[PDB]
Amino acid sequence: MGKLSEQLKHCNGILKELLSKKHAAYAWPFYKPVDASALGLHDYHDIIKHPMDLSTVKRKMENRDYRDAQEFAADVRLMFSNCYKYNPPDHDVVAMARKLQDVFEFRYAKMPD
């Protein structure tokens, strides 16, 4: 019942929700690492120094890599920030990031004390 454990449970619930069918219509571009070569995005790794995606957040949670909620939240926000950095703000993927980040921020704010 440690505070860090309990907050990490809330983080894991958020993570499960972001990966759930409820949000699938807009969450899917964040499921796997951006495959820059496959998508023809040959500048992606010159612009984004620290790629992040929900499969990587899941592997790090399963590995007990995150020591607290703050470390978890940093990777999820790195994923969104990467999207806002690389993409013109009017691109479909940006609208999808905005929507999924709204899901994230509102539930992250319900963190237990």
Ligand X SMILES: COCC(COC)n1c(-c2cc(C)c(=O)n(C)c2)nc2cc(N3CCOCC3)ccc21
Q: Which residues bind ligand X (CB under 6 A)?
A: 29-30, 34, 39, 41, 83, 86-87, 92-93, 96
**Cβ distance to ligand X smaller for residue 28 or 106:** 28
Taking phi over 0 as left and psi of -120 to 50 as alpha, with beta for the rest, 40 belongs to left
Q: Which residues contact 26 (CB under 8 A, 6 or more apart)?
A: 95, 96, 99, 100
Of the candidates 22, 86, 102, the residue with the CA atom closest to the CA atom of residue 50: 86
CB of 91 to ligand X, least distance (A): 8
Q: Which is nearer to ligand X, 42 or 64 (CB)?
A: 42
Which C-beta is closer to ligand X: that of 19 or that of 111? 19
- State the nearest-atom distance from the C-beta of 41 to ligand X, in Å: 6
Q: Which of 97, 22, 32, 35 is nearest to 58 (CA)?
A: 32
Around 112, how many Cα atoms within 13 Å sit in the side-chain half-sphere?
14
CB of 11 to ligand X, least distance (A): 20
Nearest distance in Å: CB 71, ligand X: 21
Closer of 41 and 61 to ligand X (Cβ): 41
